[PDB]
Design a protein around this motif. Structure first.
Motif, PDB file in Angstrom:
ATOM      1  N   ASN A  16    -125.261 -27.881 -19.674  1.00 56.40           N
ATOM      2  CA  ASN A  16    -124.232 -28.596 -18.931  1.00 56.40           C
ATOM      3  C   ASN A  16    -123.761 -29.797 -19.697  1.00 56.40           C
ATOM      4  OD1 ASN A  16    -125.281 -26.894 -16.733  1.00 56.40           O
ATOM      5  ND2 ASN A  16    -123.834 -28.049 -15.533  1.00 56.40           N
ATOM      6  N   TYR A  17    -122.472 -30.059 -19.622  1.00 56.91           N
ATOM      7  CA  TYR A  17    -121.877 -31.140 -20.393  1.00 56.91           C
ATOM      8  C   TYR A  17    -120.894 -31.936 -19.523  1.00 56.91           C
ATOM      9  CZ  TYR A  17    -117.679 -28.250 -21.234  1.00 56.91           C
ATOM     10  OH  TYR A  17    -116.500 -27.520 -21.075  1.00 56.91           O
ATOM     11  N   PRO A  18    -120.593 -33.175 -19.926  1.00 56.28           N
ATOM     12  CA  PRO A  18    -119.734 -33.987 -19.056  1.00 56.28           C
ATOM     13  C   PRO A  18    -118.375 -33.392 -18.696  1.00 56.28           C
ATOM     14  CG  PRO A  18    -120.776 -35.340 -20.662  1.00 56.28           C
ATOM     15  CD  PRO A  18    -121.084 -33.951 -21.071  1.00 56.28           C
ATOM     16  N   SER A  19    -117.993 -33.510 -17.428  1.00 59.16           N
ATOM     17  CA  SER A  19    -116.733 -32.972 -16.930  1.00 59.16           C
ATOM     18  C   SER A  19    -115.485 -33.466 -17.661  1.00 59.16           C
ATOM     19  CB  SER A  19    -116.607 -33.272 -15.434  1.00 59.16           C
ATOM     20  OG  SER A  19    -117.488 -32.427 -14.722  1.00 59.16           O
ATOM     21  N   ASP A  20    -115.556 -34.677 -18.200  1.00 58.73           N
ATOM     22  CA  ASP A  20    -114.416 -35.260 -18.899  1.00 58.73           C
ATOM     23  C   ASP A  20    -114.280 -34.733 -20.327  1.00 58.73           C
ATOM     24  OD1 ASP A  20    -116.820 -37.103 -19.044  1.00 58.73           O
ATOM     25  OD2 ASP A  20    -115.586 -37.985 -20.625  1.00 58.73           O
ATOM     26  N   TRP A  21    -115.262 -33.978 -20.802  1.00 58.39           N
ATOM     27  CA  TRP A  21    -115.131 -33.350 -22.115  1.00 58.39           C
ATOM     28  C   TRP A  21    -114.365 -32.037 -21.986  1.00 58.39           C
ATOM     29  CZ3 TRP A  21    -120.636 -33.402 -24.799  1.00 58.39           C
ATOM     30  CH2 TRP A  21    -121.055 -34.724 -24.922  1.00 58.39           C
ATOM     31  N   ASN A  22    -113.700 -31.647 -23.085  1.00 61.85           N
ATOM     32  CA  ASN A  22    -113.081 -30.323 -23.238  1.00 61.85           C
ATOM     33  C   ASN A  22    -113.662 -29.679 -24.507  1.00 61.85           C
ATOM     34  OD1 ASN A  22    -111.382 -31.031 -21.032  1.00 61.85           O
ATOM     35  ND2 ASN A  22    -109.567 -31.274 -22.355  1.00 61.85           N
ATOM     36  N   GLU A  23    -113.538 -28.357 -24.606  1.00 62.72           N
ATOM     37  CA  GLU A  23    -114.040 -27.581 -25.748  1.00 62.72           C
ATOM     38  C   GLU A  23    -112.892 -27.387 -26.736  1.00 62.72           C
ATOM     39  OE1 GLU A  23    -115.254 -23.562 -24.827  1.00 62.72           O
ATOM     40  OE2 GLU A  23    -115.981 -23.299 -26.918  1.00 62.72           O
ATOM     41  N   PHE A  24    -113.214 -27.483 -28.027  1.00 63.12           N
ATOM     42  CA  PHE A  24    -112.260 -27.308 -29.096  1.00 63.12           C
ATOM     43  C   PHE A  24    -112.812 -26.428 -30.201  1.00 63.12           C
ATOM     44  CE2 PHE A  24    -111.268 -31.187 -26.890  1.00 63.12           C
ATOM     45  CZ  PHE A  24    -109.875 -31.106 -26.705  1.00 63.12           C
ATOM     46  N   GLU A  25    -111.919 -25.969 -31.088  1.00 62.25           N
ATOM     47  CA  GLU A  25    -112.348 -25.003 -32.120  1.00 62.25           C
ATOM     48  C   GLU A  25    -113.233 -25.647 -33.180  1.00 62.25           C
ATOM     49  OE1 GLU A  25    -111.874 -21.530 -32.307  1.00 62.25           O
ATOM     50  OE2 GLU A  25    -113.412 -21.864 -33.838  1.00 62.25           O
ATOM     51  N   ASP A  26    -114.353 -25.016 -33.516  1.00 59.22           N
ATOM     52  CA  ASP A  26    -115.258 -25.581 -34.552  1.00 59.22           C
ATOM     53  C   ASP A  26    -115.630 -24.549 -35.628  1.00 59.22           C
ATOM     54  OD1 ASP A  26    -116.561 -28.006 -35.426  1.00 59.22           O
ATOM     55  OD2 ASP A  26    -118.502 -27.189 -34.753  1.00 59.22           O
ATOM     56  N   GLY A  27    -114.975 -23.400 -35.624  1.00 57.99           N
ATOM     57  CA  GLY A  27    -115.371 -22.320 -36.529  1.00 57.99           C
ATOM     58  C   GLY A  27    -116.383 -21.346 -35.957  1.00 57.99           C
ATOM     59  N   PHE A  33    -117.184 -30.110 -28.438  1.00 52.92           N
ATOM     60  CA  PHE A  33    -116.752 -30.703 -27.191  1.00 52.92           C
ATOM     61  C   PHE A  33    -116.563 -32.174 -27.357  1.00 52.92           C
ATOM     62  CE2 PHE A  33    -118.030 -26.947 -24.770  1.00 52.92           C
ATOM     63  CZ  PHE A  33    -118.948 -26.376 -25.609  1.00 52.92           C
ATOM     64  N   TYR A  34    -115.511 -32.675 -26.737  1.00 54.29           N
ATOM     65  CA  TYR A  34    -115.250 -34.111 -26.684  1.00 54.29           C
ATOM     66  C   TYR A  34    -114.233 -34.465 -25.630  1.00 54.29           C
ATOM     67  CZ  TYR A  34    -111.034 -33.295 -29.631  1.00 54.29           C
ATOM     68  OH  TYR A  34    -109.834 -32.819 -30.145  1.00 54.29           O
ATOM     69  N   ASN A  35    -114.150 -35.746 -25.296  1.00 55.15           N
ATOM     70  CA  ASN A  35    -113.131 -36.247 -24.362  1.00 55.15           C
ATOM     71  C   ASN A  35    -111.844 -36.540 -25.113  1.00 55.15           C
ATOM     72  OD1 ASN A  35    -111.575 -37.934 -22.594  1.00 55.15           O
ATOM     73  ND2 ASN A  35    -113.435 -38.661 -21.595  1.00 55.15           N
ATOM     74  N   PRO A  36    -110.748 -35.801 -24.819  1.00 52.09           N
ATOM     75  CA  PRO A  36    -109.507 -36.001 -25.569  1.00 52.09           C
ATOM     76  C   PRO A  36    -108.677 -37.171 -25.063  1.00 52.09           C
ATOM     77  CG  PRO A  36    -109.186 -34.303 -23.983  1.00 52.09           C
ATOM     78  CD  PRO A  36    -110.636 -34.718 -23.829  1.00 52.09           C
ATOM     79  N   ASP A  37    -109.101 -37.761 -23.956  1.00 55.02           N
ATOM     80  CA  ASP A  37    -108.408 -38.909 -23.353  1.00 55.02           C
ATOM     81  C   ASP A  37    -108.983 -40.205 -23.906  1.00 55.02           C
ATOM     82  OD1 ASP A  37    -107.080 -40.736 -21.822  1.00 55.02           O
ATOM     83  OD2 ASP A  37    -108.374 -40.392 -20.063  1.00 55.02           O
ATOM     84  N   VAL A  38    -110.194 -40.578 -23.502  1.00 55.56           N
ATOM     85  CA  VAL A  38    -110.904 -41.724 -24.079  1.00 55.56           C
ATOM     86  C   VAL A  38    -112.157 -41.201 -24.794  1.00 55.56           C
ATOM     87  CG1 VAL A  38    -112.145 -43.884 -23.582  1.00 55.56           C
ATOM     88  CG2 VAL A  38    -109.956 -43.377 -22.427  1.00 55.56           C
ATOM     89  N   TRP A  39    -112.070 -41.160 -26.109  1.00 54.12           N
ATOM     90  CA  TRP A  39    -113.094 -40.498 -26.917  1.00 54.12           C
ATOM     91  C   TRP A  39    -114.406 -41.251 -26.878  1.00 54.12           C
ATOM     92  CZ3 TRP A  39    -114.656 -41.303 -32.401  1.00 54.12           C
ATOM     93  CH2 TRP A  39    -115.357 -40.182 -32.903  1.00 54.12           C
ATOM     94  N   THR A  40    -115.495 -40.496 -26.772  1.00 55.05           N
ATOM     95  CA  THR A  40    -116.798 -41.086 -26.732  1.00 55.05           C
ATOM     96  C   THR A  40    -117.712 -40.418 -27.777  1.00 55.05           C
ATOM     97  OG1 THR A  40    -117.625 -39.581 -25.051  1.00 55.05           O
ATOM     98  CG2 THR A  40    -116.481 -41.594 -24.220  1.00 55.05           C
ATOM     99  N   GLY A  41    -117.154 -39.569 -28.630  1.00 54.35           N
ATOM    100  CA  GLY A  41    -117.940 -38.880 -29.650  1.00 54.35           C
ATOM    101  C   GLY A  41    -117.724 -37.350 -29.610  1.00 54.35           C
ATOM    102  N   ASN A  42    -118.028 -36.682 -30.744  1.00 58.04           N
ATOM    103  CA  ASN A  42    -117.908 -35.254 -30.909  1.00 58.04           C
ATOM    104  C   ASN A  42    -119.265 -34.571 -30.842  1.00 58.04           C
ATOM    105  OD1 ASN A  42    -115.165 -35.410 -31.243  1.00 58.04           O
ATOM    106  ND2 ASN A  42    -115.334 -35.430 -33.491  1.00 58.04           N
ATOM    107  N   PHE A  43    -119.477 -33.760 -29.816  1.00 60.43           N
ATOM    108  CA  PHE A  43    -120.706 -32.997 -29.652  1.00 60.43           C
ATOM    109  C   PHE A  43    -120.526 -31.588 -30.186  1.00 60.43           C
ATOM    110  CE2 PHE A  43    -123.692 -30.206 -27.461  1.00 60.43           C
ATOM    111  CZ  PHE A  43    -124.884 -30.892 -27.515  1.00 60.43           C
TER     112      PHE A  43
END
Length: 268
Positions: A16-27, A33-43
């Motif tokens: 489970n991951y924070p609701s404010d994060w979205n998933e993005f392409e990593d290969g 996953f990261y928050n595209p609004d107010v960034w808090t880091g790339n997981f």
């Protein structure tokens, strides 16, 4: 508070991951996953299966090769944890790395943050991490749509759009009035009756129109055994693109698009 559930391809793992994060392409083989609004880091997380000792071997390998790694416990996981600072484009970041594993599966998790940023969210994700045991069956479930299924939704929709353009010389908005265009391409014989993926594309496109026209229709990923597919959720039920057209075509029944669309809505 519980966040969003992710189940990996083949259901090797869940977390489970924070609701404010979205998933993005990593290969290939990795997930970002990261928050595209107010960034808090790339997981990032990636998993790998190997021989019978692969998971514990991966932990010990990291501890051996990296003198700055130490063993920490997060949930059930013994993690070889390290961090390193780097600079890119003039900005300073910290990369956190956790290597863990169990049995034949290893994980590499990382979290890249501005220097000084909290790593707590990443630790909280890893505490939720579970590796499914093969031979344990897990009940079917709907999860927030994965990027893999987002691609399938767009590819199916795009194929129908292209097909309507080619066969009918008509455009396509994804609205109710376009259902007839789908029917026209079916009636024209354009889709081979044996090509399951094209019938899935048809059903995906009907579901896209449902999301456009009917409030409360939401894309999800269905994880049902080895089946991992895009579906809609609506009024406590699932609407499966596969059952819009392919199930009928497979059975030798007519595909009536207008009827399937209405039936999705009123369940009759």
């Amino acid at each position: 508070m519980q966040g969003k559930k992710f189940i990996s391809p083949g259901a090797w793992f869940s977390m489970n991951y924070p609701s404010d994060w979205n998933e993005f392409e990593d290969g290939e083989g990795s997930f970002l996953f990261y928050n595209p609004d107010v960034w808090t880091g790339n997981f990032r997380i990636s998993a790998f299966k190997g021989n019978a000792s692969y998971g514990k071997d991966a932990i010990r390998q990291e501890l051996k090769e990296n003198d700055s790694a130490s063993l920490v416990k997060i949930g059930t996981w013994d993690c070889a944890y390290s961090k390193e600072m780097f600079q890119e484009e003039g900005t300073y970041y910290t990369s956190h790395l956790w290597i863990t594993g169990t049995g034949n599966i290893a994980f590499e998790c990382s979290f890249t943050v501005p220097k000084g940023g909290s790593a707590k969210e990443a630790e909280e994700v890893i505490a939720t991490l579970e590796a499914r045991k093969e031979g344990e069956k897990y009940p079917a479930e709907l999860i927030p749509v994965r990027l893999s299924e987002i691609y399938q939704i767009n590819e199916g929709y795009e194929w129908v759009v292209s097909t309507v353009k080619q066969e009918l010389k008509k455009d396509f908005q994804g609205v109710e009035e376009d259902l007839e265009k789908i029917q026209q391409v079916i009636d024209s014989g354009k889709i081979s009756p044996k090509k399951k993926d094209e019938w899935l594309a048809i059903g995906i496109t009907v579901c896209a129109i449902l999301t456009n026209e009917v409030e409360g229709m939401e894309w999800k990923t269905l994880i049902d055994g080895n089946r991992e597919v895009p579906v809609l959720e609506y009024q406590g039920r699932t609407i499966d693109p596969m059952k819009i057209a392919w199930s009928k075509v497979k059975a030798g029944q007519p595909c009536n698009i207008a009827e399937a669309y209405q039936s999705a809505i009123d369940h009759h």
